């Protein structure tokens, strides 16, 4: 059977889709979102971590001279110093007072635990949404997972279900994404090969297995002091540790729509935004015939108590007359209220109770039991708690009924004013007609 | 490795009309964080070291 429905993208809310099949008894279906996942595509740019300044022991050329040698080493420095007279504990290391050179060599290398402790810069685009849905209709009760697009169909008890693409293309991740362990940051990391010392990206490596390493740490070399072997050098501190103690909070603490950001892989789950179109293919076996379905007539709706709270604070009493017991499908054709139960036990007493959630003072929702029809009218009340720990179960409709007390007074005032205006119009019309008559 | 970390006491919440007031009793600098669940969140940050409201 061909049928399409649209459901909200809210977890923990069961949409009630109703199928009015022609030759069969109506069926009401449970569409329950158990959990979603918005999965972006990540393009790794580089890997940033703490660096390691390797300063080997200086060669001290006692009464001699050497020249600096260029080396294919990231951030390499090589300075020769003449006239050095170092000292050791036992005495003077070299022989001549001033005819001596010391070779100072230093460079930047990937730290031993970039393999362990590192941050990855990503680009996020084309987020792919996948959601978990429970289908429970008639006698079956199943849960399946499907990609949210008009190109995936999953079998549920012989049924072909396809959830068409996310209503909106909104994503919480920006173009540039930096991931450290379980935290994701919306950060404009510097482009590869253009890093500054002391900031994030001072040293950059394309891959963990990369052999090429870019380092810009402003390493400097300076004369040793007289009678000391220490290879003086002044260098900018690691920008990775600076970022670590200036990162602040991650995207989990600022994501809109209550998104929960996790990693492995980087994803945003249970975001409450947009709608999920549903296309349904139900076979004949699921439906029930009206010959075996009870015939329900004389359905009136009267309401004892109703409160427009977040939960199902409305209580509806229905009276009807059936011929045989069985199970009807109940639905609200109006978004004003949503009936908690989809099928109730239908017996001889002819009276049934229903729980519904509304948000308006005077709701007018319509209830159909099997094929019967009736109109439910109520005066719902402002509830007790300023705050509750659960979300609203209604559609958040606050427009009162056309026949509500407020709309009744408004309509009375409008009717009186319109009667006065039409009386004035008729009087002037008659007067003008008489004037052209004379 | 896994490290045992302390768990702060549950704050005392008095419900006002779409207001939320909490008693905070930290033994040490404790991070309080909240955000809105709607379209435009308004995240917060403050490290709590004494009793505050
Ligand atoms: C004699 C008086 C005539 C003067 C009227 C002048 C109108 C005022 C103009 C500007 C007001 C700006 C505010 C936006 C309007 C929101 C309405 C809206 O948006 O209605 C929505 C849809 O309505 C309709 O479909 C149309 C039905 C009503 C329109 C015409 C009804 C006839 C007369 C009007 C009665 C009301 C005025 C008279 C009462 C005062 C007497 C003392 C309400 O549905 P909802 O819950 O989704 O809305 C809640 C919004 N949610 C859920 C998205 C957050
Ligand atoms: C169909 O089955 C699901 C999964 O068993 C039902 O969900 C359970 O609901 C009961 C309450 O009756 C909870 O105590 C369980 O924790 C739920 N199980 C979960 C969430 O795994 C669901 O109520 C059923 N829906 C129907 C009968 O239409
Ligand atoms: C809705 C009810 C319709 C009935 C309308 C009744 C008409 C009112 C009765 C008297 C109307 C006379 C007003 C015209 C002024 C007469 C003097 C003149 O024309 O020079
Ligand atoms: C809304 C209340 C009922 C509507 C009828 C109201 C009657 C109003 C009185 C009629 C106006 C007096 C007639 C003479 C007016 C004139 O031509 O100057
Ligand atoms: C909304 C203001 C008027 C516009 C609509 C005009 C259509 C109705 C015709 C006007 C009445 C003409 C009949 C002759 C009587 C007269 O001359 O007053
Ligand atoms: C959030 O997401 C996971 C999987 O997407 C789901 O299993 C979990 O139940 C969800 N949490 C909520 C809000 O129920």
- Residue A316 sits in a domain whose CATH number is 2.60.40.350
Chain A contacts of B38, Cβ < 8 Å?
A: 256-257
| A385 in B contact zone (CB under 8 Å) | yes
Burial class from Cβ neighbours inside 10 Å (0-12, 13-18, 19+) for residue A226 reads: exposed
- Token pair belonging to A417: 């004013």
User: Best of A185, A253, A269 to disrupt the B interface by mutation (most B CBs within 10 Å)?
Assistant: A253
Chain A contacts of B43, Cβ < 8 Å?
A: 249, 253-254
User: Best of A251, A255, A257 to disrupt the B interface by mutation (most B CBs within 10 Å)?
Assistant: A257
Atom nearest to A428 CA in ligand 4 = 17
Task: State CA A307 to chain mean position distance.
Answer: 31
Cα–Cα distance, A393 to A166 (Å, whole number): 22
Burial class from Cβ neighbours inside 10 Å (0-12, 13-18, 19+) for residue A234 reads: exposed
3-state secondary structure of A420: helix
Return the number of other C-beta atoms located less than 10 Å from residue A161's C-beta. 20
User: Best of B20, B22, B39 to disrupt the A interface by mutation (most A CBs within 10 Å)?
Assistant: B39
Residue contact B41–A254, C-beta within 8 A? yes
A162-177 as b/e: b if 16+ CB within 10 A: bbbbbeeeebbbeebb
The residue in chain A having the minimum alpha-carbon distance to the alpha carbon of residue B17 is A386
Atom nearest to A416 CA in ligand 4 = 1
Task: State CA A161 to chain mean position distance.
Answer: 23
Method: cryo-EM
| B22 in A contact zone (CB under 8 Å) | no
**Closest to B45 (Cβ–Cβ): which among A249, A385, A386?**
A249
Residue contact A257–B16, C-beta within 8 A? no
In Å, how far is A386's CA from the nearest CA of chain B? 5
User: By the 8 A CB rule, do A337 and A394 touch?
Assistant: yes
Nearest CA-CA partner of A296 in A352, A371, A366: A371
Cα–Cα distance, B25 to A192 (Å, whole number): 46
Atom nearest to A417 CA in ligand 1 = 1
Nearest CA-CA partner of B29 in B3, B1, B12, B52: B52
Nearest CA-CA partner of A103 in A71, A149, A59: A59
Element (H, E) at A433: helix A405-437
Place of tokens 């004369």: A223
Chain A contacts of B2, Cβ < 8 Å?
A: none
3-state secondary structure of A432: helix
Ligand 4 close to Cβ of residue A427 (< 6 A): yes
Cα–Cα distance, A243 to A247 (Å, whole number): 5
- Token pair belonging to B3: 């490290």
CB-hemisphere CA count at 13 Å for A268? 28
Range of the domain at A332: 288-377
Q: Whose CA is nearest to atom 11 of ligand 3?
A: A427
Burial class from Cβ neighbours inside 10 Å (0-12, 13-18, 19+) for residue A185 reads: buried
Q: What is the resolution of this structure in A?
A: 2.8
User: By the 8 A CB rule, do A329 and A18 touch?
Assistant: yes
In Å, how far is A387's CA from the nearest CA of chain B? 6
Among A266, A270, A272, residue to substitute to test ligand 6 (most atoms within 8 Å of Cβ): A270
CA of A169 to the centre of ligand 2 (A): 32
Among A415, A418, A424, A427, residue to substitute to test ligand 3 (most atoms within 8 Å of Cβ): A427
Largest Cα separation within chain B, whole Å, is 45
Place of tokens 């979603």: A36
Cα–Cα distance, B53 to B49 (Å, whole number): 12
Give residue ranges with CB within 6 A of ligand 5.
A 432, 436
- Token pair belonging to A270: 């249970």
Residue contact A253–B43, C-beta within 8 A? yes
| A387 in B contact zone (CB under 8 Å) | yes
Between the alpha carbon of residue A130 and those of residues A7, A9, A43, A146, the distances in Å are 15, 12, 20, 6
Ligand 3 close to Cβ of residue A434 (< 6 A): yes
Q: What angle do CA A128, A131, A132 make, to 5 degrees?
A: 155
Cα–Cα distance, A171 to A255 (Å, whole number): 10
Between the alpha carbon of residue A155 and those of residues A144, A152, A161, A162, the distances in Å are 8, 10, 7, 9
């Amino acid at each position: 059977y061909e049928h399409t429905a649209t459901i909200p993208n809210v977890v923990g809310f069961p949409y009630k889709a109703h199928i009015e099949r022609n030759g069969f008894s109506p069926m009401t279906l449970q569409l329950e979102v158990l959990g979603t996942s918005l999965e972006p595509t990540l393009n790794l740019e580089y890997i940033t971590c703490e660096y390691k300044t390797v300063v080997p022991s200086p060669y001290i050329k006692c009464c001699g001279t050497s020249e600096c040698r260029s080396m294919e080493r990231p951030d390499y420095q090589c300075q020769v110093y003449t006239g050095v007279y170092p000292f050791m504990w036992g005495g003077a290391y070299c022989f001549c007072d001033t005819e001596n050179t010391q070779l100072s060599e230093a460079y930047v290398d990937r730290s031993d635990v970039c393999k362990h402790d590192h941050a990855a810069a990503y680009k996020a685009h084309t987020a792919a949404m996948k959601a978990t849905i429970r289908i429970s209709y008639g006698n079956l009760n199943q849960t399946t997972t499907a990609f949210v697009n008009g190109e995936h169909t999953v079998t549920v008890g012989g049924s072909r279900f396809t959830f068409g693409p996310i209503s909106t293309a909104w994503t919480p991740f920006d173009n540039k994404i930096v991931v450290y362990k379980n935290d994701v940051y919306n950060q404009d990391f510097p482009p590869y090969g253009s890093g500054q010392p002391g900031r994030f990206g001072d040293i950059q490596s394309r891959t963990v297995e990369s052999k090429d390493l870019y380092a810009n740490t402003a390493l400097k070399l300076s004369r040793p002091s007289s009678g000391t072997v220490h290879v003086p050098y002044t260098q900018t501190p690691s920008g990775f540790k600076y970022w670590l103690k200036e990162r602040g909070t991650s995207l989990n603490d600022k994501a809109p729509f209550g998104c929960v950001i996790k990693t492995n892989p980087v994803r945003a789950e249970n975001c409450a935004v947009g709608n999920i179109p549903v296309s349904m293919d139900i076979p004949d076996t699921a439906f029930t015939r009206v010959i075996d379905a009870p015939a329900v007539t004389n359905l009136e709706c009267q309401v004892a108590v109703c409160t427009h709270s977040s939960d199902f604070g409305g209580i509806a009493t229905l009276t009807f007359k059936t011929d045989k017991p069985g199970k009807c499908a109940v639905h609200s054709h109006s978004n004003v209220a949503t009936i908690q139960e989809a099928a109730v036990d239908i017996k001889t007493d002819g009276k049934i109770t229903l729980h519904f959630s509304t948000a308006s003072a005077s709701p007018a929702f319509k209830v159909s039991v099997c094929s019967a029809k009736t109109t439910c009218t109520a005066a719902c009340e402002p509830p007790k708690d300023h705050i509750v720990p659960y979300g609203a179960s209604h559609n958040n409709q606050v427009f009162p009924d056309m026949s509500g007390t407020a709309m009744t007074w408004v309509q009375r005032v409008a009717g009186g004013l319109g009667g006065l205006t039409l009386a004035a119009v008729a009087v002037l019309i008659l007067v003008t007609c008489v004037t052209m008559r004379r | 490795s896994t490290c045992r970390v302390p768990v702060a006491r549950a704050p005392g919440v008095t419900y006002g009309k779409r207001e939320l007031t909490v008693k905070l009793h930290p033994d040490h600098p404790t991070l309080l964080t909240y955000r809105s669940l709607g379209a435009d969140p308004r995240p917060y940050e403050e490290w709590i070291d004494r009793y505050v409201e």
